[PDB]
């Protein structure tokens, strides 16, 4: 069947791998052959209770690229009543809310209208994880047997958490965690990896791993000089926004891939909307 | 149609025939959507006063008819007349909600052939709110005649009750039940209008008195700032609807509420078959669609 | 294949006389024969870092009139990164930013995505100059050999600067600068005009030029920009009344970039010379023409 048809996407953990591969294949096919009229008569609510211009513009561009119309707001009465009302207007609800659990709460009152969570919180940012994995698969050719380093604040970086857990669903990956000692990756994730035969290590500098990595996911400030011995296929990724952790001289190098990654956000979210609102895989 | 390029500023600008046409068009668009009726139209959603509820509903109506939307959600030597003079050269219709009463009517004076639709939901003129109320009543009851309709809450300042009672009074055989604190009773001119047309009505102090007789239960809030705290403590639990209160309700009965609600309807009502306020809000889509369709498209489908 | 394709439009001075004539002919062609699906499947970003309901509504209506989709914000991370990201989503960026360099800077990071400036900076309001030029050409039949008076604050009115510079690219225009001495047209513009042997003169009242002018371009005088000792130099001579038009030529048109305050009395509005609202409306076709030329290589209509 189509396993995502009219399913809620509130958390990345609600997706089996089979689901992940399906979303990725649809993302790639829509990237190759766009379906600008697939959702021609659908209306989608873009409800950003908490403002986030980048993510809203990406989501809404995805909607328009699929031919859907958009109503919405950025920034009283209970959230449940707001959702109970809106779900009578629209065909899907894309929502970002400052409170964790708000998206699931909306699913309790949205009826048959799917909710897609665009939050950045701990629970999930499923479309961000999907666009990360999609960028990795596009640039490396696969999601198995990869070398992935994660740099920066790994205790509060929720996208490294989700991305590590999703990558652990594929075989033969090796992880390198480079962070100050005060902000190490949580043990529950390291234990998740330990229980599988997945190899991981800690490092205090990127120079230790620079020659072996296929993906460098940023959150020490990275300069172009540091990339002297990188693999030709190596890509620097970043969920964005960045401040200083990537210096601007990285931008002109071939390894800089954070903006292309953001651009792939369009095809991840197009794939999610298409799969959730379209029965038939006429993609 | 009789409404082509008509302004919709007040429900009173509509004859009984105009009103029947709007309601019939709403029913037709709910049953058989016309998603490209307004394909090449551009509509301005001008919310000088913010209202997420109404804007999302109105803009959804616009998109369900295939129209494009430009607009603003809130807010120099700029003037309302000049602003309308400019905007009416861009777009094919102007949907506007403005904090001053009379502003939409004033705008029709500078819009030329561009129709203006008043998007207010609660002041002295909220035509699309009354239209969606009437549409919900007719859809769930089969008619707008010979009905038992109860109005509950602050009936002195609940203006949607004022509009709804006046609209229902244009039909035959309706009977009204007014449940309010004595300081918040229906305006005298409306009761006099009901007597002047020979419409039967009665006053009551609680929902228990009438629950078994009513086909429509239209709820309103009672704000504490309307009353002495004395009276409010004394009377507050008296105008709150809970599931328990519906034990002897007629099977056909529907609970309506213009929304938003606070406490005046407990959440245990949502789960009963009589809760219909969200469906009412949803019918707002088709009332507003019907207005846009009749105002911007000449020939009927 | 057209010369503006995928070009950034940041300043009016980036366009030759021939370019302007092409843009204006395109605007006229789109006004006469609408192309509602010319930009179908295009997605355009409307980025108003600084609010401007006027210009935003005009620009976005243009986008929708050509069939484009619109994503954006009206506001009130670095700009380069913001553009680097957004230019991966959309096919063009329409931009208004309070800082003078922001639109050029964005062009450095937008890749192949064209940037169109919607600012009101010094030389950074190209679509305002384009709609001015288009309105002048439409009502007078030409952009050559005109008598053009500019009234009001010519020192800080940046759109009179743009317009004077653009008309100076045509032959035989004659200029009338009517302003307080403290707010006179800047010397560098007069020097540019002297260098192209273009004739201009200063005058103290609208009545002096009324009988000769084809265009009366009005702006407001904000007396705050003056010394109190100069308040008396701003009396009635920079405000147009209907009475003032007794000896005006039949073809004369009164223009104004808007908003207006008192410098054009409302009794001018019903006269045939009032043309500021039609001008604002022509903004649609100037902006449509720019978007069409920038986003479509082969423009067949």
From Swiss-Prot, chain A:
Family: Belongs to the aspartate/ornithine carbamoyltransferase superfamily. ATCase family.
GO cellular component, one term: cytoplasm
Lineage per the UniProt record: Bacteria, Pseudomonadati, Pseudomonadota, Gammaproteobacteria, Enterobacterales
Its biological purpose: Catalyzes the condensation of carbamoyl phosphate and aspartate to form carbamoyl aspartate and inorganic phosphate, the committed step in the de novo pyrimidine nucleotide biosynthesis pathway.
A Gene Ontology molecular function term of the record: identical protein binding
Gene that encodes it: pyrB
Catalysed reactions, as listed in the record: carbamoyl phosphate + L-aspartate = N-carbamoyl-L-aspartate + phosphate + H(+)
This protein's UniProt keywords: Pyrimidine biosynthesis, Transferase
Quaternary state and interactors: Heterododecamer (2C3:3R2) of six catalytic PyrB chains organized as two trimers (C3), and six regulatory PyrI chains organized as three dimers (R2).
Gene Ontology biological-process entries: 'de novo' pyrimidine nucleobase biosynthetic process; 'de novo' UMP biosynthetic process; glutamine metabolic process; protein homotrimerization
Pathway(s) it belongs to: Pyrimidine metabolism; UMP biosynthesis via de novo pathway; (S)-dihydroorotate from bicarbonate: step 2/3
Protein name in UniProt: Aspartate carbamoyltransferase catalytic subunit
Coiled coil location: none
Residue sites binding carbamoyl phosphate per the record: 54-55, 96, 125, 128, 240-241
Domain of life assignment: Bacteria
Organism: Escherichia coli (strain K12)
Cross-referenced PROSITE patterns: CARBAMOYLTRANSFERASE
Cross-referenced InterPro entries: Asp/Orn_carbamoyltranf_P-bd, Asp/Orn_carbamoylTrfase, Asp/Orn_carbamoylTrfase_sf, Asp_carbamoyltransf, Asp_carbamoyltransf_Asp/Orn-bd
From Swiss-Prot, chain C:
Top-level taxon in the UniProt lineage: Bacteria
E.C. no: 2.1.3.2
Gene3D superfamilies, alphabetized: Aspartate/ornithine carbamoyltransferase
Binding residues for L-aspartate: 158, 220
Keywords of this entry: Pyrimidine biosynthesis, Transferase
Keyword Transferase on entry: yes
Keyword field contains Oxidoreductase: no
GO annotation terms (biological process): 'de novo' pyrimidine nucleobase biosynthetic process; 'de novo' UMP biosynthetic process; glutamine metabolic process; protein homotrimerization
Function: Catalyzes the condensation of carbamoyl phosphate and aspartate to form carbamoyl aspartate and inorganic phosphate, the committed step in the de novo pyrimidine nucleotide biosynthesis pathway.
Similarity section: Belongs to the aspartate/ornithine carbamoyltransferase superfamily. ATCase family.
Protein name: Aspartate carbamoyltransferase catalytic subunit
